């Protein structure tokens, strides 16, 4: 009989990535455009939306912001441990706490 | 930048902010008591000249300038216009 085609792209066990680098390359853990002057001196809000094939079963999104999660752990005296947590773009604490 | 060199978030590397004695020691005992996974080397990226702003398409589209057809062949006559100050490694 005649025939009309169809195609998908099943891709599982992997998360989509949109690196912040200018050319979208793995040019360094702390991206080129990340350190750019414009984003390093004046914050920005963000609006950003997705499509989804309608699934009648309720579903919830999942988004990550690829943020440095560094930690430094020092022990000055026998039995004392001091730590510094940090999250440069999404700091876990600021002047308000 | 400080508050960034403090976490080694981006700053001098693991072999050049540790006390040189400890670099020596870790190089001495890395074969059975590795310590290279405890201190993180920071890794920045080149920030000055390697990405352009002047608006350059990432990927280009070209249409056949003309063509032919011999019922067995099919010629396509493309005009590869590479702009000034760009390189298009013909692999891609």
């Amino acid at each position: 009989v005649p025939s009309l085609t169809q195609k998908k792209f099943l891709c599982d066990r992997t998360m989509w990535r949109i690196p912040f680098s200018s050319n979208f390359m793995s040019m360094g853990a702390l991206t080129d455009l990340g350190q750019n002057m414009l984003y390093a001196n004046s914050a920005h809000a963000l609006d950003m939306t997705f499509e989804v094939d309608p699934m009648d079963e309720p579903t919830l999104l999942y988004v990550l912001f690829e943020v440095f999660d560094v930690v430094r752990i020092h022990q000055p005296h026998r039995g004392v441990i001091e730590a510094v947590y940090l999250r440069t773009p999404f700091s876990a604490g600021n002047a308000t706490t | 930048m400080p508050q960034w060199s403090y976490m080694h978030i981006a700053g001098q590397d693991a072999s050049e902010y540790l006390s040189p004695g400890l670099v020596q020691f870790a190089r001495a005992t890395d074969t059975y008591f590795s310590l290279g996974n405890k201190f993180r080397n920071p890794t920045v990226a080149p920030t000055h000249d390697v990405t352009t702003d002047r608006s350059q398409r990432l990927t280009l589209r070209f249409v056949p300038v003309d063509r032919e057809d011999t019922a067995y062949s099919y010629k396509v006559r493309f005009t590869l216009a590479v702009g000034d100050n760009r390189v298009l490694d013909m692999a891609s």
Partner: peptide
């Protein structure tokens, strides 16, 4: 690379 660790081309 370079010496502030990794990178690429701000060094000729």
């Amino acid at each position: 690379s370079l010496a502030p660790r990794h990178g690429s081309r701000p060094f000729m």
